[PDB]
Paper text:
Bromodomains (BRDs) are protein interaction modules that specifically recognize ε-N-lysine acetylation motifs, a key event in the reading process of epigenetic marks. Despite large sequence variations, all BRD modules share a conserved fold that comprises a left-handed bundle of four α helices (αZ, αA, αB, αC), linked by loop regions of variable length (ZA and BC loops), which line the Kac binding site and determine binding specificity. The four helices form a deep cavity that is extended by the two loop regions (ZA and BC loops), creating a largely hydrophobic Kac binding pocket.
The C and N termini are highly diverse and may comprise additional helices that extend the canonical BRD fold (e.g., the sixth BRD of PB1 has an additional C-terminal helix) or largely extended kinked helices that are present as C- or N-terminal extensions (for instance in TAF1L or ATAD2).
Residue numbers in the entry: 979 to 1108
Protein backbone atom coordinates (compact mmCIF):
# COMPACT_ATOMS: atom_id res chain seq x y z
CA UNK A 1 0.00 0.00 0.00
CA UNK A 2 0.78 3.74 0.08
CA UNK A 3 1.01 3.37 3.89
CA UNK A 4 3.58 0.58 3.41
CA UNK A 5 5.66 2.53 0.87
CA UNK A 6 5.84 5.45 3.36
CA UNK A 7 7.06 3.00 6.09
CA UNK A 8 9.89 1.78 3.88
CA UNK A 9 10.74 5.34 2.78
CA UNK A 10 10.98 6.40 6.46
CA UNK A 11 13.30 3.39 7.10
CA UNK A 12 15.55 4.48 4.20
CA UNK A 13 15.68 8.06 5.54
CA UNK A 14 16.60 6.72 9.00
CA UNK A 15 19.26 4.37 7.54
CA UNK A 16 20.88 7.11 5.42
CA UNK A 17 21.20 9.39 8.43
CA UNK A 18 22.77 6.70 10.65
CA UNK A 19 25.09 5.64 7.79
CA UNK A 20 26.26 9.25 7.24
CA UNK A 21 27.00 9.64 10.97
CA UNK A 22 29.23 6.54 10.75
CA UNK A 23 30.86 7.53 7.46
CA UNK A 24 31.97 10.95 8.78
CA UNK A 25 33.53 9.49 11.93
CA UNK A 26 37.36 9.69 11.48
CA UNK A 27 37.82 6.26 13.07
CA UNK A 28 35.75 4.62 10.34
CA UNK A 29 37.42 6.13 7.25
CA UNK A 30 38.90 2.72 6.36
CA UNK A 31 35.33 1.36 6.01
CA UNK A 32 34.06 4.18 3.78
CA UNK A 33 35.41 2.72 0.50
CA UNK A 34 35.98 -0.65 -1.14
CA UNK A 35 39.45 -2.13 -0.77
CA UNK A 36 41.71 -1.19 -3.73
CA UNK A 37 42.64 -4.34 -5.74
CA UNK A 38 45.97 -2.69 -6.62
CA UNK A 39 46.86 -1.90 -3.00
CA UNK A 40 45.38 -5.20 -1.70
CA UNK A 41 45.28 -7.81 -4.52
CA UNK A 42 44.49 -10.86 -2.35
CA UNK A 43 41.46 -9.09 -0.75
CA UNK A 44 38.85 -10.08 -3.33
CA UNK A 45 40.01 -13.75 -3.03
CA UNK A 46 40.14 -13.86 0.84
CA UNK A 47 36.93 -11.89 1.44
CA UNK A 48 34.01 -13.42 -0.47
CA UNK A 49 31.54 -10.66 0.32
CA UNK A 50 33.26 -7.24 0.51
CA UNK A 51 31.15 -4.57 2.25
CA UNK A 52 31.76 -0.91 3.07
CA UNK A 53 29.69 2.16 3.98
CA UNK A 54 29.54 3.44 0.38
CA UNK A 55 28.05 0.11 -0.71
CA UNK A 56 25.59 0.36 2.22
CA UNK A 57 24.39 3.78 0.97
CA UNK A 58 23.95 2.32 -2.55
CA UNK A 59 21.93 -0.62 -1.16
CA UNK A 60 19.62 1.72 0.83
CA UNK A 61 18.81 3.60 -2.36
CA UNK A 62 18.30 0.30 -4.25
CA UNK A 63 15.70 -0.64 -1.58
CA UNK A 64 17.66 -3.67 -0.43
CA UNK A 65 16.99 -3.07 3.23
CA UNK A 66 13.35 -3.55 4.22
CA UNK A 67 14.14 -3.94 7.94
CA UNK A 68 16.87 -2.73 10.33
CA UNK A 69 17.94 -6.39 10.65
CA UNK A 70 18.83 -6.48 6.93
CA UNK A 71 20.91 -3.27 7.38
CA UNK A 72 22.68 -4.51 10.54
CA UNK A 73 23.63 -7.71 8.70
CA UNK A 74 25.77 -5.59 6.33
CA UNK A 75 27.21 -3.49 9.21
CA UNK A 76 28.12 -6.79 10.85
CA UNK A 77 29.72 -7.92 7.57
CA UNK A 78 31.95 -4.78 7.43
CA UNK A 79 33.08 -5.68 10.94
CA UNK A 80 33.50 -9.45 10.47
CA UNK A 81 35.40 -8.94 7.14
CA UNK A 82 37.84 -6.59 8.97
CA UNK A 83 38.42 -9.09 11.79
CA UNK A 84 39.01 -12.00 9.34
CA UNK A 85 41.30 -10.12 7.02
CA UNK A 86 43.38 -8.50 9.84
CA UNK A 87 43.63 -11.16 12.54
CA UNK A 88 47.26 -10.62 13.62
CA UNK A 89 48.76 -9.17 16.86
CA UNK A 90 50.56 -6.38 15.09
CA UNK A 91 49.52 -2.76 15.78
CA UNK A 92 48.09 -2.10 12.27
CA UNK A 93 45.81 -5.17 12.58
CA UNK A 94 44.83 -4.45 16.17
CA UNK A 95 43.90 -0.83 15.25
CA UNK A 96 41.58 -1.84 12.34
CA UNK A 97 39.88 -4.53 14.50
CA UNK A 98 39.34 -2.02 17.31
CA UNK A 99 37.82 0.40 14.77
CA UNK A 100 35.70 -2.39 13.19
CA UNK A 101 34.25 -3.28 16.60
CA UNK A 102 33.58 0.37 17.39
CA UNK A 103 31.79 0.81 14.01
CA UNK A 104 29.63 -2.19 14.90
CA UNK A 105 28.96 -1.11 18.49
CA UNK A 106 28.25 2.47 17.44
CA UNK A 107 25.65 1.42 14.83
CA UNK A 108 23.93 -0.96 17.25
CA UNK A 109 23.80 1.77 19.90
CA UNK A 110 22.28 4.44 17.60
CA UNK A 111 19.60 1.96 16.47
CA UNK A 112 18.87 0.93 20.08
CA UNK A 113 18.40 4.54 21.16
CA UNK A 114 16.73 6.01 18.05
CA UNK A 115 14.77 3.30 16.19
CA UNK A 116 11.35 2.74 17.73
CA UNK A 117 10.78 -0.97 18.32
CA UNK A 118 7.21 -0.75 16.98
CA UNK A 119 8.45 0.93 13.81
CA UNK A 120 10.93 -1.97 13.28
CA UNK A 121 8.19 -4.51 14.07
CA UNK A 122 5.98 -2.95 11.38
CA UNK A 123 8.83 -3.15 8.84
CA UNK A 124 9.26 -6.82 9.69
CA UNK A 125 5.53 -7.56 9.36
CA UNK A 126 5.24 -5.87 5.94
CA UNK A 127 8.40 -7.67 4.79
CA UNK A 128 7.06 -11.06 6.03
CA UNK A 129 3.78 -10.40 4.14
CA UNK A 130 5.72 -10.26 0.85
CL1 LIG B 1 45.17 5.82 10.18
Amino acid sequence: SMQEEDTFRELRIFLRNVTHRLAIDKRFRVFTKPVDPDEVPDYVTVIKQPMDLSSVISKIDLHKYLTVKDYLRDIDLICSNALEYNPDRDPGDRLIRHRACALRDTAYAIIKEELDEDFEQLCEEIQESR
